[PDB]
Nucleic acid binder design. Structure first.
Ligand SMILES: O=C1Nc2ccc(Cl)cc2[C@@](C#CC2CC2)(C(F)(F)F)O1
Ligand SMILES: [Ca+2]
Ligand SMILES: [Ca+2]
Lengths: 544, 404
RNA sequence: GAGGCCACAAUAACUAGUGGCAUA
DNA sequence: GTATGCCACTAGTTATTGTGGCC
């Protein structure tokens, strides 16, 4: 006796009362044949007028989307699935598929009446044969959570007597692993089959059991290693939007074991609204990226399982334009898994910051898969990290990492001054734009009497404040004081960006490395502060 | 023993909060703790037909590194708030904030004896997760009043007054306040005979060091200079102009007048008499108690924190922005560790003064906070928190507070 | 009776709060 | 003139499409 699990409908809802559409004669003859056998085995029972519910007859015999919508929620199982790199190496592995899974769990008695369904009559002159389920139906929302729960109770006694044997439940399958030599493993497998059989659960016998490797969730699981099923990424002379979507899916799937995969350039090609049939021209830096990906995927790879008595090491490399790859291993050149990290894209972020978020993502993934955080090896000097994080408003914390000298390193290209530079020319910068016409001006005025204004087309307030800083840098000497009222423009400069999507900010970073001393100061707009006032009158002339 | 009926507000569903993933060392500690709690009847395993869930963590608590279990009942507490505040609300003693010394004691085990209403137990569901999702997840629910639920002291409150009522006749100038699983004992007695007086209470109930007036708001102090430069004036003007949202009497008009025309930043600027006077009233506004701020009991408290650098943090407690009920400085290891002790300091001080915990605004990325906050947590409550940027002028302003 | 369900990713949309600015 | 947009930081949500699965 497997005990039933009490199941209720959602508050306020009654059961399904859907109409059964007429079917072909060749279809009704098959249904009454399936159903009479299910009645003889006790899985369904003929019902009659006392039952007011119905669900249309349909993998699945019956289509329960209406019932499923009205069924209570379950705090449901197999939220996530194991990742292979978190499994331990085994000597012997078996997979048992439980044949009569749902047919072996009785459905809560007072819930049975909601699973009613009708095989219709041929000419619909007659009413049809009506049934309901006595067991978990295929396709009912509760069957997976209730079967899993039953299987967990059935496996408790066997798990207890056999501590050394690992059993993972996955849908209808048991994955059974052990360090026993194959013969003594098979003795245990058959003991497990007998245990399951007491509750009516049937499994393949030794002759019918599959041999490693096991195909599971797109992986190929060996006793000592794992790989993905082999990626095939096509070769086309014209790429459609749907095709590019397909490639990014394969490439992102591949990036968990193939190191150094990069998708950022094929992703840019999917921006904007575009029909799925539109042939999209590959930009050549996307073509270049698609090329190095075809290279990576020609070599063969595998990952190894996890030895819980070694440390995990995670190593990160910069791949340029906000892209990062990483590798997890415990023994050198024997990866458990790899992955990638990609920035927001539109925004320009400091490289120390991008690296810290790669670490953050990897740390979270690593607690999920192995239950412990890794030791990091990062292309950043311990004092480059220190000067950046002690000068930044935000808190962070990487518990243990160390410098590894694999270029491109991350470094701070420039260092701004804390105090104004004596004898250097003071620039007051400002910009202005009108939203309607998208016209703007940017300029400066100088304590030494100099001034400039430039007019810009298709621009914004934010761009003109950066243009104005662009000009002050362009037209000053190796030492300069600059004064702005844009905390935006100023924050971009202090949070030294990596090379980004904006050519304006890249020019500015370039100008700032070439400088020898630069002090930047913020003043509030519209306060009568000299300098700022003079440049504001200049720049706002054609604009306000 | 008979259970108080409990109920969610009649439009509400139960907690369905996702469990943040745990380390292996804490999953093992939770499994051990929970089999012992189940063996004593406190929790029960539940089936899949229970759809609710509430996160669970493990913290090192009671100064000893024997693991403790912390259930994060924040969502449930919000969903039962009329029950534990309107109907069975503990009152907060305004006198507690004035005692010279206040110690805090864990009254957590007292809830274990009291049963919990049948129809409410499903809402206390939690889930011990498993590494790499390799096993389905061990589900329990409470049979006794849970620590961390705010309705626990609300229900046990009538029993709690009878344990302490004999004590109150003895020492009638001692004040006791209960906030969740904690007892705050207020005394004006010398520190030597404070500990003897707080032990005898501890011994008394088993048979069944804060200094609040040391806390005090420091005033802002401005630069004092023999010579002022264009740059010094510009930095000061930008700060005082921002700070006028806090002190409306602050003025920068006479300081801005000194910055006539396009000056080099290093030029020296003599403070005229009008400037010296404006600066001198500005100082006096800032050295005086801030005024016009008063606590509104129908409003959430908010606590904001700024990373000041070099192991220094500034914080403000308020209800409406710029109307600070309190400000202060927390001093000294890593950012997350320091930030966790600041949050706990600010929360108990907030419990003592108002009987409420503030909603925190933390200057950290959420995912980093969610990875590490239990590494140093010692408290039985968990405040509400959200994650924010820190504008530069905020950091620059509260950096000017005087030190003890 | 026009497929749903899980993880991950990309895209789009709705964004909201803080901040300084930019036009009215 | 409060009302907006402009984007840096912080936090999201509902839809589509794709990869890998399942029913
Ligand atoms: O912990 C291990 N180690 C391991 C190694 C190889 C194989 Cl093929 C299988 C396993 C196993 C599993 C599983 C599910 C992911 C399918 C097993 F349960 F043991 F089978 O889990
Ligand atoms: Ca400006
Ligand atoms: Ca301007």
């Amino acid at each position: 006796p497997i005990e039933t699990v009490p199941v209720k409908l959602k508050p306020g809802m009654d059961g399904p009362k859907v109409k059964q559409w007429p079917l072909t004669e060749e279809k009704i003859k098959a249904l009454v044949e399936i159903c009479t056998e299910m009645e003889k085995e006790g899985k369904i029972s003929k019902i009659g007028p006392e039952n007011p519910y119905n669900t249309p007859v349909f993998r699945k015999l019956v289509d329960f989307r209406e019932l499923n919508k009205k069924t209570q929620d379950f705090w449901e199982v197999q939220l996530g699935i194991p990742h292979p790199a978190g499994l331990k190496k085994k000597k012997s592995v078996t997979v048992l598929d439980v044949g009569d899974a749902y047919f072996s769990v009785p459905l809560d008695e007072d819930f049975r009446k909601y699973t009613a369904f009708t095989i219709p009559s041929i000419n619909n002159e007659t009413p049809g044969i009506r049934y309901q389920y006595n067991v978990l139906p295929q396709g009912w929302k509760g069957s997976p959570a209730i079967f899993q729960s039953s299987m967990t109770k059935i496996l408790e006694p066997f798990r207890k007597q056999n501590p050394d044997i690992v059993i993972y439940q996955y849908m209808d399958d048991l994955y059974v692993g052990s360090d026993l030599e194959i013969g003594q493993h098979r003795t245990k497998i058959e003991e497990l089959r007998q245990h399951l059989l007491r509750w009516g659960l049937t499994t393949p016998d030794k002759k019918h059991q599959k041999e490693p490797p096991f195909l599971w969730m797109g992986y190929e699981l060996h006793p000592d290693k794992w790989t993905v099923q082999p990626i095939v990424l096509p070769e086309k002379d014209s790429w459609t939007v749907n095709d590019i979507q397909k490639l990014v899916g394969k490439l992102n799937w591949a990036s968990q074991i193939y190191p150094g995969i990069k998708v950022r350039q094929l992703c840019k090609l999917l921006r904007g609204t575009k029909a799925l049939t539109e042939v999209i021209p590959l930009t050549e830096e996307a073509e270049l990226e698609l090329a190095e990906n075809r290279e990576i995927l020609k070599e063969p790879v595998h990952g190894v399982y996890y030895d819980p008595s070694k440390d995990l090491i995670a190593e990160i490399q910069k791949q340029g334009q906000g892209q990062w790859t990483y590798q997890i291993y415990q023994e050198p050149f024997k990866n458990l898994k790899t992955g990638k990290y990609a920035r927001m894209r539109g925004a320009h972020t400091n490289d120390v910051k991008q690296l810290t978020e790669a670490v953050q993502k990897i740390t979270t993934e690593s607690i999920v898969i192995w239950g412990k955080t890794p030791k990091f090896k990062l292309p950043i000097q311990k004092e480059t990290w220190e000067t950046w994080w002690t000068e930044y408003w935000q808190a962070t914390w990487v518990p243990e990492w160390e410098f590894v000298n694999t270029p491109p390193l991350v470094k701070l290209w420039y260092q701004l001054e804390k105090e104004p530079i004596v004898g250097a020319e003071t620039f007051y910068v400002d910009g202005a734009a009108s939203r309607e016409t998208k016209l703007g001006k940017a300029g400066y005025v100088t304590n030494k009497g100099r001034q400039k204004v430039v007019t810009l087309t298709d621009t914004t307030n934010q761009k003109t404040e950066l243009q104005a800083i662009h000009l002050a840098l362009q037209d000053s000497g190796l030492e300069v004081n600059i004064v702005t009222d844009s905390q935006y423009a100023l924050g971009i400069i202090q949070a030294q960006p990596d090379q980004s999507e904006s050519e304006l900010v890249n020019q500015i970073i370039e100008q700032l490395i070439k400088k020898e001393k630069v002090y930047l100061a913020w003043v509030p707009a519209h306060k009568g502060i000299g300098g700022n006032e003079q440049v504001d009158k200049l720049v706002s002339a054609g604009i306000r | 023993i008979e259970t108080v009926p409990v109920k969610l507000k009649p439009g509400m569903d139960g907690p369905k909060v996702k469990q943040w993933p745990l380390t292996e060392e804490k999953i093992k500690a939770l499994v051990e703790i929970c089999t012992e709690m189940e063996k004593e009847g406190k929790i029960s395993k539940i089936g899949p037909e229970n759809p609710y869930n509430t996160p669970v963590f493990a913290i090192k608590k009671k100064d000893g590194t024997k693991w403790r279990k912390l259930v994060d009942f924040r969502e449930l507490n919000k969903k039962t708030q009329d029950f534990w505040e309107v109907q069975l609300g503990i009152p907060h003693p305004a006198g507690l904030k004035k005692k010279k010394s206040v110690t805090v004691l864990d009254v957590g085990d007292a809830y274990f004896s009291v049963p919990l209403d049948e129809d409410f137990r499903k809402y206390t569901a939690f889930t011990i997760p498993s590494i790499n999702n390799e096993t389905p997840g061990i589900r329990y629910q409470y049979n006794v009043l849970p620590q961390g639920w705010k309705g626990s002291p609300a229900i046990f409150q009538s029993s709690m007054t009878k344990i302490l009522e004999p004590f109150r006749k003895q020492n009638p100038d001692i004040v006791i306040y209960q906030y969740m699983d904690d007892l705050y004992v207020g005394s004006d007695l010398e520190i030597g005979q404070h500990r003897t007086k707080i032990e005898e209470l501890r011994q008394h109930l088993l048979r069944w060091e804060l200094h609040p007036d040391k806390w005090t708001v420091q005033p802002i102090v401005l630069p004092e200079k023999d010579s002022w430069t264009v740059n010094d004036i510009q930095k000061l003007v930008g700060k005082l102009n921002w700070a006028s949202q806090i002190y409306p009497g602050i003025k920068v008009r006479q300081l801005c007048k000194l910055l006539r025309g396009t000056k080099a930043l290093t030029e020296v600027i003599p403070l005229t008499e009008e400037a010296e006077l404006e600066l001198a009233e500005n100082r006096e506004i800032l050295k005086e108690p801030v005024h016009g701020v008063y606590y509104d009991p129908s409003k959430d408290l908010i606590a904001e924190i700024q990373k000041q650098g070099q192991g220094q943090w500034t914080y403000q407690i308020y209800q409406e922005p710029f109307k600070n009920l309190k400000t202060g400085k927390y001093a000294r290891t890593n950012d997350v560790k320091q930030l966790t002790e600041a949050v706990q300091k600010i929360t108990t001080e907030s419990i003592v003064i108002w009987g409420k915990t503030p909603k925190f605004k933390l200057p950290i990325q959420k995912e980093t906070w969610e990875t590490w906050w239990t590494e140093y947590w010692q408290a039985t409550w968990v405040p509400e928190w959200e994650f924010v940027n820190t504008p530069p002028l905020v950091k620059l302003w509260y950096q000017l507070e005087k030190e003890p």
